[PDB]
């Protein structure tokens, strides 16, 4: 509800 794909990897 805040930012899509927020659990992005590095």
């Amino acid at each position, epitope marked *: *509800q*805040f*930012r*899509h*794909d*927020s*659990g*992005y*990897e590095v």
Partner: antibody
Amino acid sequence: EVQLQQSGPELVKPGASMKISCKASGYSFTGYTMNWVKQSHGKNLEWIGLINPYNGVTRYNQKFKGKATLIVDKSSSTAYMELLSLTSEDSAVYYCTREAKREWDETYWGQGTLVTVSA
Amino acid sequence: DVVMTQTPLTLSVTIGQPASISCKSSQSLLYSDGKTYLNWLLQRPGQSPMRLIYLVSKLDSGVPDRFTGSGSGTDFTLKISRVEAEDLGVYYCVQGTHFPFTFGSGTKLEIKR
């Protein structure tokens, strides 16, 4: 369909630690990041942190560092938030939410869990 | 942290009349990918919050076309072209561009009759 079913309300004593659960169903659990949100007195909303169940990435609001611990149980498609060292000000409604993966994805909220910290 | 300032605190509108509410951020919500992660939520009496608008102006599925979001940078606006009784509740803006994500303190829409 997609549902986020949270723990029922809890009475917990100050100084204990206690777990909230958020059981996800209707979608690929590891495909979406889960967020946790605090709402005090039906007023202000605060973002606690997020956890990506696929890769274990876990980001916290620094305000809640050392108060909340986020884990997942992929086997049961359940997200958990541990609330540590409980005090009166942890009394609140806690929500889990499912984030979008693609831009066009729907987002979802659990029904909330009312925590009362009291002796 | 990004401070989200919503005005007014409450808005009272007659059925059929327009509504406008403001959300201002203390920092730009423009992210490095060119997108602006500003969202509008509505929390109705007794319910969980639900998102109505994302990326400033995109309507979530099922949301009436009476709702429009606009803005850029640090100044954002939610408008209702004609208010219906079912629109009442508390409207929150929430930003997802900067960690930690932060919410406005809400505008309560009240219906006049």
